Amino acid sequence: KDLDNPLLKALLAENKNSETTKKLLEDHQNSLKVLKEKLNSYYSVNSKTLHTVEDAMYSFLPGFSNLK
Amino acid sequence: KDLDNPLLKALLAENKNSETTKKLLEDHQNSLKVLKEKLNSYYSVNSKTLHTVEDAMYSFLPGFSNLK
């Protein structure tokens, strides 16, 4: 909600030469990537009885693994 | 809240962003004052506009008064 505000878009359009603001924008994108990576890392750790079902689909398609 | 967003305030804290902030947020402050006055006078203006609409609703059609 914060990064998609119309005021932010208007400010970005008004000052194209915003390298100082561009640094903050890239910092925000890095925070985006870090948060998404952490959220996904909270997933690809463990599984359940779904492993037996998963083994059924790795046999018919050789060379396939790590379905998340 | 969008105007008072802490991230937007941090972006505001820039000098080159402050001039475009000057323009955009003086316009925004005028708009906020206008909308606050609109909320304050909403009841007052609705009765007056309703009276004008009723006057125009039955003005040039013969007969037809007291539309309720």
mmCIF file of C-alpha atoms in Angstrom:
data_model
loop_
_atom_site.group_PDB
_atom_site.id
_atom_site.type_symbol
_atom_site.label_atom_id
_atom_site.label_comp_id
_atom_site.label_asym_id
_atom_site.label_seq_id
_atom_site.Cartn_x
_atom_site.Cartn_y
_atom_site.Cartn_z
ATOM 1 C CA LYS A 1 0.000 0.000 0.000
ATOM 2 C CA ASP A 2 2.792 2.446 0.858
ATOM 3 C CA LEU A 3 4.962 1.888 -2.228
ATOM 4 C CA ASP A 4 1.972 2.141 -4.614
ATOM 5 C CA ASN A 5 0.603 5.461 -3.347
ATOM 6 C CA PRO A 6 -0.319 7.963 -6.096
ATOM 7 C CA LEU A 7 1.645 10.678 -4.279
ATOM 8 C CA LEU A 8 4.828 8.598 -4.515
ATOM 9 C CA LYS A 9 4.262 8.086 -8.248
ATOM 10 C CA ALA A 10 3.686 11.820 -8.733
ATOM 11 C CA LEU A 11 6.872 12.625 -6.805
ATOM 12 C CA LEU A 12 8.855 10.114 -8.873
ATOM 13 C CA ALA A 13 7.488 11.532 -12.134
ATOM 14 C CA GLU A 14 8.120 15.146 -11.095
ATOM 15 C CA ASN A 15 11.851 14.608 -10.435
ATOM 16 C CA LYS A 16 13.329 12.174 -12.954
ATOM 17 C CA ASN A 17 16.863 13.059 -11.790
ATOM 18 C CA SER A 18 16.483 11.552 -8.309
ATOM 19 C CA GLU A 19 19.678 9.545 -7.822
ATOM 20 C CA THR A 20 19.569 10.304 -4.093
ATOM 21 C CA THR A 21 15.965 9.078 -4.067
ATOM 22 C CA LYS A 22 16.932 6.274 -6.464
ATOM 23 C CA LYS A 23 19.312 4.947 -3.803
ATOM 24 C CA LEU A 24 16.427 4.766 -1.326
ATOM 25 C CA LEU A 25 14.269 3.098 -3.987
ATOM 26 C CA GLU A 26 16.896 0.402 -4.563
ATOM 27 C CA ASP A 27 17.199 -0.019 -0.788
ATOM 28 C CA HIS A 28 13.437 -0.583 -0.659
ATOM 29 C CA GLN A 29 13.706 -3.142 -3.471
ATOM 30 C CA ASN A 30 16.496 -4.900 -1.561
ATOM 31 C CA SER A 31 14.199 -5.000 1.472
ATOM 32 C CA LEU A 32 11.508 -6.457 -0.807
ATOM 33 C CA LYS A 33 13.873 -9.218 -1.907
ATOM 34 C CA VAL A 34 15.083 -9.921 1.640
ATOM 35 C CA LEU A 35 11.549 -10.167 3.036
ATOM 36 C CA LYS A 36 10.381 -12.426 0.202
ATOM 37 C CA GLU A 37 13.462 -14.636 0.583
ATOM 38 C CA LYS A 38 12.873 -14.966 4.332
ATOM 39 C CA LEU A 39 9.185 -15.775 3.816
ATOM 40 C CA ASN A 40 10.077 -18.469 1.280
ATOM 41 C CA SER A 41 12.863 -19.816 3.514
ATOM 42 C CA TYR A 42 10.204 -20.286 6.191
ATOM 43 C CA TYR A 43 8.792 -22.930 3.799
ATOM 44 C CA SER A 44 11.405 -25.127 2.082
ATOM 45 C CA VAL A 45 12.496 -26.983 5.215
ATOM 46 C CA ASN A 46 10.184 -29.882 6.105
ATOM 47 C CA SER A 47 7.183 -31.820 4.797
ATOM 48 C CA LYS A 48 4.683 -34.470 5.957
ATOM 49 C CA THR A 49 2.980 -37.639 4.652
ATOM 50 C CA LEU A 50 2.840 -35.680 1.390
ATOM 51 C CA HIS A 51 6.317 -37.104 0.706
ATOM 52 C CA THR A 52 4.822 -40.465 -0.294
ATOM 53 C CA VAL A 53 2.509 -38.717 -2.767
ATOM 54 C CA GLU A 54 5.471 -36.686 -4.028
ATOM 55 C CA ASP A 55 7.516 -39.817 -4.762
ATOM 56 C CA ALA A 56 4.790 -40.917 -7.195
ATOM 57 C CA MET A 57 5.403 -37.998 -9.581
ATOM 58 C CA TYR A 58 9.222 -38.069 -9.527
ATOM 59 C CA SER A 59 9.271 -41.547 -11.105
ATOM 60 C CA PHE A 60 7.225 -40.786 -14.227
ATOM 61 C CA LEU A 61 9.318 -37.682 -15.047
ATOM 62 C CA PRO A 62 13.035 -38.437 -14.639
ATOM 63 C CA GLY A 63 15.256 -35.537 -13.660
ATOM 64 C CA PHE A 64 12.597 -33.805 -11.538
ATOM 65 C CA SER A 65 13.040 -32.976 -7.855
ATOM 66 C CA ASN A 66 12.330 -30.377 -5.161
ATOM 67 C CA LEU A 67 8.681 -29.521 -5.830
ATOM 68 C CA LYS A 68 7.581 -26.596 -3.643
ATOM 69 C CA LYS B 1 -2.130 8.821 6.917
ATOM 70 C CA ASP B 2 -0.771 8.770 3.358
ATOM 71 C CA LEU B 3 0.513 12.321 3.831
ATOM 72 C CA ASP B 4 1.852 11.399 7.295
ATOM 73 C CA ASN B 5 3.434 8.119 6.163
ATOM 74 C CA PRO B 6 6.795 7.694 7.963
ATOM 75 C CA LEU B 7 8.430 6.340 4.800
ATOM 76 C CA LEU B 8 6.948 9.232 2.827
ATOM 77 C CA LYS B 9 8.288 11.605 5.497
ATOM 78 C CA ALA B 10 11.752 10.059 5.142
ATOM 79 C CA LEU B 11 11.528 10.596 1.380
ATOM 80 C CA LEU B 12 10.272 14.134 2.090
ATOM 81 C CA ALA B 13 13.381 14.863 4.174
ATOM 82 C CA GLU B 14 15.344 15.318 0.926
ATOM 83 C CA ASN B 15 16.180 18.828 -0.272
ATOM 84 C CA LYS B 16 15.393 18.362 -3.970
ATOM 85 C CA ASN B 17 12.305 16.377 -2.975
ATOM 86 C CA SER B 18 11.271 19.233 -0.659
ATOM 87 C CA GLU B 19 10.589 21.690 -3.500
ATOM 88 C CA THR B 20 8.313 19.237 -5.288
ATOM 89 C CA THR B 21 7.087 18.488 -1.771
ATOM 90 C CA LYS B 22 6.475 22.221 -1.386
ATOM 91 C CA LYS B 23 4.222 22.296 -4.457
ATOM 92 C CA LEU B 24 2.492 18.931 -4.075
ATOM 93 C CA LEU B 25 1.833 19.205 -0.346
ATOM 94 C CA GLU B 26 0.716 22.834 -0.380
ATOM 95 C CA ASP B 27 -1.847 21.667 -2.934
ATOM 96 C CA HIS B 28 -2.577 18.660 -0.703
ATOM 97 C CA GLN B 29 -3.010 20.834 2.403
ATOM 98 C CA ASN B 30 -5.407 23.112 0.529
ATOM 99 C CA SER B 31 -7.315 20.020 -0.622
ATOM 100 C CA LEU B 32 -7.445 18.638 2.928
ATOM 101 C CA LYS B 33 -8.772 21.958 4.230
ATOM 102 C CA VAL B 34 -11.399 22.028 1.463
ATOM 103 C CA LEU B 35 -12.549 18.479 2.254
ATOM 104 C CA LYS B 36 -12.646 19.214 5.993
ATOM 105 C CA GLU B 37 -14.805 22.275 5.321
ATOM 106 C CA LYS B 38 -16.960 20.108 3.041
ATOM 107 C CA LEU B 39 -17.484 17.616 5.869
ATOM 108 C CA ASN B 40 -18.275 20.439 8.303
ATOM 109 C CA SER B 41 -20.785 22.115 5.956
ATOM 110 C CA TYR B 42 -22.197 18.935 4.378
ATOM 111 C CA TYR B 43 -25.519 19.201 6.219
ATOM 112 C CA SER B 44 -25.792 22.944 5.555
ATOM 113 C CA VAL B 45 -25.274 22.696 1.793
ATOM 114 C CA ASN B 46 -27.485 19.632 1.216
ATOM 115 C CA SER B 47 -30.619 21.462 2.369
ATOM 116 C CA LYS B 48 -29.874 24.472 0.151
ATOM 117 C CA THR B 49 -29.148 22.402 -2.967
ATOM 118 C CA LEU B 50 -32.266 20.325 -2.293
ATOM 119 C CA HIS B 51 -34.328 23.525 -2.199
ATOM 120 C CA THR B 52 -32.914 24.669 -5.549
ATOM 121 C CA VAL B 53 -33.534 21.243 -7.101
ATOM 122 C CA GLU B 54 -37.124 21.261 -5.828
ATOM 123 C CA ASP B 55 -37.615 24.771 -7.222
ATOM 124 C CA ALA B 56 -36.290 23.640 -10.604
ATOM 125 C CA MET B 57 -38.120 20.300 -10.387
ATOM 126 C CA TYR B 58 -41.471 22.115 -10.530
ATOM 127 C CA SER B 59 -40.846 25.473 -12.211
ATOM 128 C CA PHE B 60 -42.112 25.556 -15.811
ATOM 129 C CA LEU B 61 -44.486 22.579 -15.862
ATOM 130 C CA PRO B 62 -48.017 23.908 -15.202
ATOM 131 C CA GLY B 63 -49.282 22.661 -11.857
ATOM 132 C CA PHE B 64 -47.176 20.167 -9.966
ATOM 133 C CA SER B 65 -46.166 21.549 -6.555
ATOM 134 C CA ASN B 66 -45.079 20.013 -3.242
ATOM 135 C CA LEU B 67 -42.988 17.139 -4.620
ATOM 136 C CA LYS B 68 -42.346 14.801 -1.673
#
